[PDB]
Design a protein around this ligand. Structure first.
Ligand SMILES: [Mg+2]
Ligand SMILES: [Mg+2]
Lengths: 590, 590, 148
């Protein structure tokens, strides 16, 4: 039964008799003297065993790393010459008087004085979590959720739980099914989110809801993509979007002030259009000062097929990227970039070296100067406000390929030329997203989701030109990452029906899939907006880590596996027969 | 944009103009004057529309049940004769100066002044949750989880999430399977609870863990038993059972003070053995003052077999139930109980009417006094402390028959004779639960998980006489309901092996049921122990409901179906296709 | 049972397909007026005999459909199955159909006593009448519990 945690002890404790519980971190013999660096969640404290107490020193000579021990001793000032300014407890040590070895420990299969593969660490996850760097991530994660909860509470959001055993619904995405042993042949779905349930709660009278809940995406797992993730789910009533962003922008500033101790200022606000016109993504990193420019309009009448083509293509754009001091680039250099953009499906990467606008065409060097002309090149420079000693790359292709590749080359050229200040925080709000996005199969899909309200288009106009409808949707981006987002919901039935229509789902399907939703909108539905936060990303950002698996106690690999428990695995054959199901071949039956 | 919540208005708001957003709960007219009970999440407030102009009014005459409106008016005192005692806001009303109908509402499919099947309410859950009586239970649950969190965080517990997608073939094969799209033919399992992960987190050095987390059962959905349920999950290191009980007790006490304003007071503690003896239950209702008295030893020699046998049998008992003021009882009434105990296996129910002890055998009245004698009846009246007026009922059978019968008889009688003050809070701790028991065919099986440690036995003494070994496990009962339980786990490997040996769980079993854990115990495992409170129960007790469905926002029915969303449902073949599974059915000879 | 061997609802399906079980329907005349409270009591009364519950179907306007009835299990059943039940049991408007789904012995024990209770509680049982009868073809033997 401890009396204090090893790592909290400071000079202020000098004099007290304490009982420490924890693990042997290191051990160092200094003559007949035995020193132990004892460890527990608060940290490490040096424990001194004197030969004056024969039995404690007796047992202490068997101590090896990771032994589970208990020591009752006296805290005391280390000598000036022994102060260790790099340990929080660096000014004291505990002169032990008693020791009890609670449990010996096998040699760890996870070496510590050396680096390990995220793999070996994940198999011995329990062991890897004993590391300070690691355990501090989880402790700050606990701190953050705690700062969130107190916030929501002070602001009046009720923590209401939603079900995890859900109903598999249409569109949105892919779910994890759960067969039923009671309703043989039927399933539930792990929720992607409390999406429809929280709205149902705003219609139930609760006025402000929040929940820190688990969501499951059964789509392929990317880099920092787990099959499960945790969201700070929020829903409000009787509030506009600007109002929703306000308090939501407050919760985040509060987090950055309490945790990293930084102030962020009022978040700037950009529209989806501006964000794309200027950075090629709906989650810009404003840490990088550079920005794209459009010139297709200037290249419609050129002979050059690489420009003319995408410039006369309704779905194309030719984006210019003015990279300061870029003229200095080399051929090998310019080519990596050229190949780089290829990765994002782009062709090449035309360019212009602006050595001196004081010599017109003569002041610029370029593989494509002969294709443009004196006039067109002057406008391109003015439009880009090119500087002498500046390079101008051009991405000409399909709007999506250009945004994709040019916004990528924009970021890469940022690190290379040292133009991005990785040290800064660039938070912002991207608003005015479209309602739908082409689904590649003939129709439209909800940019955010089926229940997003259109900024100002009427049901009729929406029927008329859905592709152009703007949404009452907003995302919070911080340094190039989508931390959260949401929208003002639709509180009118004809409107909701109309969108289900554009989404290609018919009355009958609407009835059976969103029937409960379509009926509830008939009973005084209040205006309501919400927003969800990416907890994991938030924690990553706040614990200064890039490995999402570093902020999760027991994460899964990129293949959705748990190397420590070995799931997924084969289910008891019996289990399946009780569930009235069986595994088959991709080909075999049908 | 509200300025206050309807239900928070009080006499101290008089003179203040307010802006309220809410719904029409009821509407009443006095000529052209319209009175409305305006409701929102805090409760109802009376709003009166009394403009002395036919212009302004118009809107108000349109309001109907569940209209979502915004009104801004001024607060004032209700005339003394109309002040409403049963309304938190009943001493005031709001005089409206502005009205905005935000959204109409069709006629409600749910009946207000009529009776609705819990079937209809469940189908229109978002309508039923509007009832202030319903909103309140969920508002309190939010305050309860808020209180728990703050309390746990303050007493050093870390909120650390554990995975929902887990290792299948985990516990009792009583879980939900989630098929893997990525690992064809493999499955994860929804957790019964963070069962093994909280113990791992103790090995990882976190020192104290807790989490408000969902759990899943997959048995036959009894009433009061949902397919998923929330638990306040707890685990500690370097703490004994008593030290675990104390902190968990301060939690509950803290919850009652802050929520019901009652001071539960130190919790009585009992042993599983004392509980069965005294109350014939492992979950005693102490709101009932009665208790069973063993009197077997007083009857070991009588000629009467009914008593002599069960009294002499080592596995039989003769329990005496003294019901204060029971002599004044009817043959009719004494016959009902006579029958009632038959439902649990009782062959009968002898009794002694105590009219006037001072007078001896002539002081009592009993059909079995004949077969007894003066001394025996005197010893018994002494042991049971019978006062004149008291009735002594006797259950003389097998330890189980007597326990359930008299156990039950005690509860019924107490309610009947108004002896149990249903309004008292009776918390307690039941401990020292047996370690083992007979499973299906016998042998021995763990009463709790296999990682539970013996209370007062050596690995050898345990291996030597496991049958009645006593576990170091504990339960928290409040008014006759298990509300929490836990136990001290094993940290000594020799001991874990002996348990497994007694349990029949061989090496291969151990390794697949919990190999990573068993592995984890090789690195200096600290003494650890935990517990879990069912949050639902806790909330039922704290809001005086008896229906589990009233404390959950979106509960399933007994059949585990959700009447609103209509889950579970038939899955899309496409989806079943990617999942590499298919629904099948016994092709019984056809 | 034969009416429900198909249904995905295991509560009925299990015992209807299980030869050592049965799905028994009990028709109580004009028992539709029974109360939320009264149904629940019966619900618990059957437990005494081993029953894990009591599904019911309140028959209002028969010739009106699944619309004419009212039942918590109706959604796990369908139009065709429910007419067969109302027909077979010869249900009538205002009637009440109770269901016992378990192993033969439990259904017999539960619905058998339930049948008796409801009769007295509703006075459908005229005890002024004399009802004699012969019960023939008893089993030869009984399970001895210990194997023989
Ligand atoms: Mg997104
Ligand atoms: Mg229990």
């Amino acid at each position: 039964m401890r009396t204090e945690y090893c790592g909290q002890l400071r000079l202020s404790h000098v004099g007290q008799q304490v009982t420490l519980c924890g693990w042997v971190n290191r051990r160092r013999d200094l003559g007949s003297l035995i020193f132990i660096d004892m460890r527990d969640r608060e940290g490490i404290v040096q424990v001194f065993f004197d030969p004056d107490r024969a039995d404690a020193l007796k047992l202490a000579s068997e101590l090896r790393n990771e032994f589970c021990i208990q020591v009752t001793g006296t805290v005391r000032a280390r000598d000036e010459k022994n102060i260790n300014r790099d340990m929080a407890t660096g000014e004291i040590e505990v002169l032990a008087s008693s020791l009890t070895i609670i449990n010996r420990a096998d040699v760890l299969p996870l070496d510590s004085n050396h680096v390990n593969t995220e793999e070996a660490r994940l198999k011995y996850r329990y062991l890897d979590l004993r590391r300070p760097e690691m355990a501090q991530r989880l402790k700050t994660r606990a701190k953050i959720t705690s700062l969130v909860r107190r916030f929501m509470d002070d602001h009046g959001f009720l923590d209401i739980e939603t079900p995890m055993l859900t109903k598999a619904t249409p569109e949105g995405a892919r779910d994890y099914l759960v067969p039923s042993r009671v309703h043989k042949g039927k399933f539930y779905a792990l929720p992607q989110s409390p999406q429809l349930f929280k709205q149902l709660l705003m219609m139930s009278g609760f006025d402000r809801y929040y929940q820190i809940v688990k969501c499951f995406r059964d789509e392929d797992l990317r880099a920092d993509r787990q099959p499960e993730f945790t969201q700070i789910d929020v829903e409000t009533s009787f509030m506009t979007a600007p109002q929703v962003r306000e308090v939501m922008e407050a919760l985040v500033r509060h987090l950055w002030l309490e945790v990293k101790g930084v102030d962020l200022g009022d978040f700037p606000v950009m529209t989806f259009a501006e964000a794309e016109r200027r950075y090629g993504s709906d989650k810009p990193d404003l840490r990088n000062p550079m920005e794209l420019t459009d010139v297709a309009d200037l290249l419609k009448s050129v002979e050059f097929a690489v420009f003319a083509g995408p410039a006369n293509d309704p779905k194309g754009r030719v984006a210019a990227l003015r990279v300061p001091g870029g003229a200095s680039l080399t051929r090998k250099q310019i080519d990596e970039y050229g190949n780089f953009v290829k990765i994002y499906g782009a062709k090449g990467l035309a360019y212009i070296k602006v050595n001196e606008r004081a010599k017109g065409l003569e002041g610029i060097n370029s593989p494509v100067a002969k294709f443009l002309n004196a006039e067109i090149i002057e406008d391109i420079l003015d439009r880009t406000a090119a500087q002498d000693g500046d390079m101008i790359f051009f991405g000409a292709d399909n709007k999506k390929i250009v945004a994709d590749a040019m916004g990528a080359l924009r970021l890469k050229v940022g690190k290379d030329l040292g133009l991005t200040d990785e040290s800064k925080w660039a938070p912002l709000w991207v608003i005015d997203f479209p309602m739908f996005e082409d689904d590649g199969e003939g129709g439209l899909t909800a940019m955010h989701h089926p229940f997003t309200s259109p900024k100002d288009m009427t049901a009729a106009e929406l029927k008329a030109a859905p592709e152009n409808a703007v949404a009452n949707a907003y995302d919070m981006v911080i340094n190039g990452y989508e931390v959260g987002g949401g929208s003002v919901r639709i509180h009118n039935g004809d409107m909701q029906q109309t969108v289900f229509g554009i989404l290609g789902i018919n009355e009958e399907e609407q009835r059976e899939k969103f029937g409960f939703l379509l009926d509830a909108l008939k009973y005084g539905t209040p205006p309501h907006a919400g927003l969800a936060f990416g907890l994991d990303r938030l924690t990553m950002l706040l614990t200064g880590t890039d490995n999402i698996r570093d902020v999760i106690a027991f994460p899964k690999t990129t293949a959705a596996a748990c190397l420590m428990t070995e799931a997924p695995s084969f289910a008891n054959p019996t289990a399946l027969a009780e569930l009235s199901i069986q595994v088959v071949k991709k080909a075999e039956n049908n």
